[PDB]
Amino acid sequence: KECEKDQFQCRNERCIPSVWRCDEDDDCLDHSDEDDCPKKTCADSDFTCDNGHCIHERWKCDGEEECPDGSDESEATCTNECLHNNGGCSHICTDLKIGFECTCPAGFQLLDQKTCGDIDECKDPDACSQICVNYKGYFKCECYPGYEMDLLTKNCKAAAGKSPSLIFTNRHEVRRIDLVKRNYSRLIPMLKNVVALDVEVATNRIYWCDLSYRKIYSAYMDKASDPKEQEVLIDEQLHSPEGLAVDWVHKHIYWTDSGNKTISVATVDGGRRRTLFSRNLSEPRAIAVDPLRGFMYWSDWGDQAKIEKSGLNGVDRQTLVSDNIEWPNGITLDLLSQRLYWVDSKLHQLSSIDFSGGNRKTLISSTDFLSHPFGIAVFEDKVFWTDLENEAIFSANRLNGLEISILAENLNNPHDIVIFHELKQPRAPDACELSVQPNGGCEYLCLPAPQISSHSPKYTCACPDTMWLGPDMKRCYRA
């Protein structure tokens, strides 16, 4: 016997409201609902009383009881050498009774031993949304090309013109949500079983994948609803592709397939194709490309959960995340500030990491708003995601993790989500076209290489799955 959705199950088979989990009342009668409850340490410099209640440091040691047990007022609580020459202290000094103390002001708080130096503010990813310049004792934010600093708010917004949309799959249809207006429209009606999609903004194409017909399709958005104007790109050799990614610079589609257990690549027309990875993949899900630096990133929730990283030609594969990771199944990139965002369906988290793999940050950790999340998207100051238990798309401030709004709801199967906007897909040179020979010399595929040094190779050729690259590095040899 299990409990209903919003109940907690006691060890003695009894169901209580889950909001009575960890509130210091034994409601199960066998103390079950009050076991392994997380303890409490407060904000920046707040005093923890003997029972875990949070009071400001200044109320402590003043004769008045603040904490509900009154333990800041027992003797295990407490303890002008200061104005004259400043008494060894550099900036702000206040005289304490048992010894003097020395702290700093706003903008420079870092001290070795009570002498203060500047805060380097740009050693934090989410200090500014975009560009961060560090000065002595303060800092300043600027905007990446295409973005204007809104003077009323804090934020770098997109230059005025065409406004952001969200495009997402409801499993049997695709829906578009305007963002400036609220203009909520059905972009494709009547699909069998579709969880994966991506868009090419500049040519106005939508790419999506059906798991039941086992095909990958493509259409123009103005004509996507007309079944005749939906083109089949791939109709063979697919099992269950759950992730898609379009490389807009170099005209390739990348997909995962958790059935065949592979990661693949194909030309946008679907005419030339290679499998890039077969081995050490269990349940690969989401895939995203960084075509400006030649990389691709993906997730898998097999027994060993990873976010992995490789070149767009599928060399130089490395694991990027393998700790505190259970069920990661949504992934998105901020290309300009070189930052990766993921959601974890089991651990109920929304986290971020550097493209390099460090400066890892747990942005949101709410079991209420991240019950079973799936798709994830990023634009300007906000992060978006879809939830399967809450039947909805949420938004939030992606710098702090706060301001969690609820963008649309009453959605039965909301899976994958993309931001449709010109600025998500910057223009970049395609090296397979600025080349001595057409198509970089290649007979089949020209795949962008990962830029590791400033002079790496810019591309490399690739052959069908049933053929090998010859010694010229450019021709395909038969079997």
């Binding site: 009575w20 603040e66 002001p105 706003a106 961060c132 300043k140």
Partner: protein, 710 residues
């Protein structure tokens, strides 16, 4: 001689503007912005290292009533407010011999006017960053020639005052309409507008909020309050049981200014305020708290209410004030200020739960189903959460969490002759078979006084036509979601009645409740005949009920009822059976088992709706006191009937407490008035002395006509 003055300090100091400046060397002060928008401009910067005098005098300049002094000051650059070393803006009319403060400290307790405002002294700790200060000359009695000083004091070596600085000084004519308060007037010809505001005069901007609320939460950045001078978030001497409040203990400036709000249709400002935090009475030389309002972004202020300290102002009190016509603007800001001549204060004071809003245009409807918790409908709701519960349709507002206070207050609405109240209510959903009730109340004085909505009306009182208890919302009968529909009694009629659901202390956490699908209005008709819900002025009929006003029945209703109480009560027969169960304890009322009402809580027996158009009689057996006899007339069971699906009942018999000592046979002709197509019956006991006491029992119920006989 000169007509104006101007100095940005960005391009060095400017010889001809000033006489001299002891202690201020051009540079960078308080540059920081956590939002990454720093002040990089240069300023006059009177450090706490410079020895001797800290000041700055202007050259004598000619002046009239159009002259304004406009400048950005920064004293201290932090939020530890202090009255030490304030910066005074003084003027000399005697070629720099003796100086007077440009503004006096006007208030009711001097070259003063009617209005109340603080002097031109600028204390430390009022903001983090740079503030903009503007003084007008029109009502000062100044014309001709004068020189101005920003003064801090003469200081010895080794004596560290507070640092201060100043930027962007201007002493010329005012602009067109004073830039509306949201712009830095330059040369009297050019408005340099504030962000969000556009146009030559700064007139064009986005519409303001028409509502405001701050219970005081840990995200205290939000642009509700333009400044919170000398006031900290606290839990010390909370007026709420254990809420979070705003405390004014520090000395310096004590002000609280809201953002500009759309008050063009506002009814009220309300809040809790304790003027004096401690044990004994705060001393009668403590300065009163003034509540003021500006129509023009803070150039001139009117008084709403003075708040004096007294012997009886020691504990929290709910303030509610109707909004005066002269305060209803597209842009109006309010301020709370405690005056002080030196800047020191005797008594500390505290504030919580500030709400500004309301719609004075005579709105007569309030509807909700709880997609959103629109807090301009639900002003207050402590201990309540938006969530589903007990298989609610979508969400309900739910009082389930551990909290020491549980209530919910509606905003004001116009109640009239056709107004009615309709809600879905539910209690514990079988989780605890405890006995409790929720108080439903109302107010016509903006919640300064709450009155129970319905009162005990019993047949003892002859001036009662309908009979009903005050405790409508009991936990046994409303165990699972049920609908209540009350016509609104005449004592609730007004332009602005508000309503409350209150769970009085004490209670257990386990005694939970929820409300969903609230309609309080005058819409629809007939209150949907009792078989419906008013949704946006149209009846949404119940299962098996049709018609425009929910009175056309879709299926056939039973024409006969019969129970001998051999099996547990069926819902084929009985809508509700509360407090009663089958037993033989009562001997033999009619035959074998009977239904016996011996419960600790409610004793209620209601039938399904019946088609009684051709029925003749209602009959049953009745017996009192199988354990204890009823002692009052008010312990007598009542037999009523409703024909509007339970909204209003009609008495058909008082079963007097003193008869039916022995089991008796009741047998009544149905009044023409009860033989309608949808009629139900109830048996209920208004009052009893608890479990197992003053009990009664029914057997062989039969509502019917005479048989066809073959």
């Amino acid at each position: 001689n000169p007509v104006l003055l101007l100095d940005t300090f960005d391009f060095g100091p400017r010889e001809d503007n000033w006489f001299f400046y002891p202690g201020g060397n051009i540079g960078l002060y308080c540059p920081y912005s956590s939002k990454g928008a720093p002040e990089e401009d240069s300023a006059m910067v009177f450090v706490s290292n410079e020895v001797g005098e800290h000041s700055i005098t202007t050259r004598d300049l000619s002046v009239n009533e159009n002259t304004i002094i406009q400048f950005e000051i920064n004293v201290g650059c932090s939020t530890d407010s202090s009255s030490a070393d304030p910066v005074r803006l003084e003027f000399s009319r005697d070629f720099g011999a003796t100086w007077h403060l440009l503004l006096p400290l006007c208030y009711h307790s001097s070259l003063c006017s009617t209005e109340h405002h603080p002097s031109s002294t600028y204390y430390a700790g009022t903001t983090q960053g740079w503030r903009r200060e503007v003084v007008h000359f029109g009502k000062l009695h100044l014309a001709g020639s004068v020189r101005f000083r920003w003064y801090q004091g003469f200081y010895p070596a080794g004596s560290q005052p507070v640092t201060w600085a100043i930027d962007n000084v201007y002493i010329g004519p005012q602009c067109e309409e004073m830039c509306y308060g949201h712009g830095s007037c330059i040369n009297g010809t050019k408005c340099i507008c504030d962000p969000g505001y556009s146009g030559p005069t700064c007139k064009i901007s986005t519409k303001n909020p028409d509502f405001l609320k701050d219970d005081f939460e840990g995200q205290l950045e939000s642009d509700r309050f333009l400044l919170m001078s000398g006031g900290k978030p606290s839990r010390k001497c909370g007026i709420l049981s254990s809420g979070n409040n705003l405390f004014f203990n520090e000395d310096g400036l004590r002000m609280l200014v809201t953002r500009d709000l759309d008050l063009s249709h506002a009814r009220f400002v309300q809040f809790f305020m304790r003027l004096g935090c401690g044990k004994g009475v705060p001393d009668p030389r403590s300065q009163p708290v003034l509540l003021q309002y500006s129509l023009n972004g803070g150039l001139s202020w009117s008084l709403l209410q003075e708040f004096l300290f007294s012997n009886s102002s020691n504990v929290g009190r709910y303030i509610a004030l109707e909004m005066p016509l002269k305060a209803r603007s597209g842009s109006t800001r309010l301020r709370w200020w405690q005056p002080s001549e030196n800047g020191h204060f005797y008594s500390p004071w505290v504030i919580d739960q500030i709400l500004i809003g309301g719609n004075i245009s005579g709105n007569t409807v309030l509807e909700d189903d709880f997609s959103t918790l629109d807090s301009r409908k639900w002003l207050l709701h402590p201990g309540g959460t938006k969530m589903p519960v007990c298989g609610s349709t979508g969400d309900a507002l739910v009082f389930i969490e551990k909290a020491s206070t549980r209530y919910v207050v509606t905003t004001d609405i116009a109640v009239n002759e056709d107004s009615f109240l309709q809600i879905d209510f539910a209690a514990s959903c079988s989780v605890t078979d405890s006995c409790y009730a929720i108080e439903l109340e109302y107010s016509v004085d903006l919640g300064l006084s709450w009155h129970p909505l319905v009162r005990d009306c019993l047949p003892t009182n002859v001036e009662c036509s309908r009979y009903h208890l005050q405790r409508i919302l009991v936990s046994d009968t409303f165990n699972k979601w049920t609908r209540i529909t009350l016509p609104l009694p005449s004592y609730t009629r007004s332009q602005a009645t508000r309503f409350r659901w209150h769970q009085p202390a004490p209670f257990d956490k386990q005694q939970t409740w929820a409300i969903d699908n609230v309609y309080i209005g005058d819409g629809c008709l007939d209150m949907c005949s009792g078989h419906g819900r008013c949704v946006q002025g149209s009846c949404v009929c119940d299962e098996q009920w049709g018609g425009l006003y929910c009175d056309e029945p879709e299926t056939s209703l039973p024409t006969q009822l019969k129970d001998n109480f051999n099996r547990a009560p069926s819902n084929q027969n009985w809508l509700t059976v509360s407090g009663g169960k089958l037993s033989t304890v009562c001997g033999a009322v009619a035959s074998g088992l009977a239904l016996h009402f011996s419960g600790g809580c409610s004793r209620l027996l209601v039938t399904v709706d019946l088609n009684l158009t051709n029925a003749e009689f209602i009959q049953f057996y009745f017996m009192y006191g199988c354990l204890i006899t009823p002692s009052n007339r008010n312990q007598g069971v009542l037999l009523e009937y409703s024909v509007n699906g339970g909204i209003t009942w009609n008495l058909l018999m008082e079963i007097f407490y003193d008869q039916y000592s022995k089991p008796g046979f009741v047998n009544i002709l149905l009044p023409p008035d009860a033989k309608e197509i949808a009629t139900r019956f109830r048996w209920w006991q208004p009052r009893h002395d608890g479990l197992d006491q003053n009990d009664w029992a029914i057997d062989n119920v039969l509502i019917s006509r005479l048989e066809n006989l073959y």
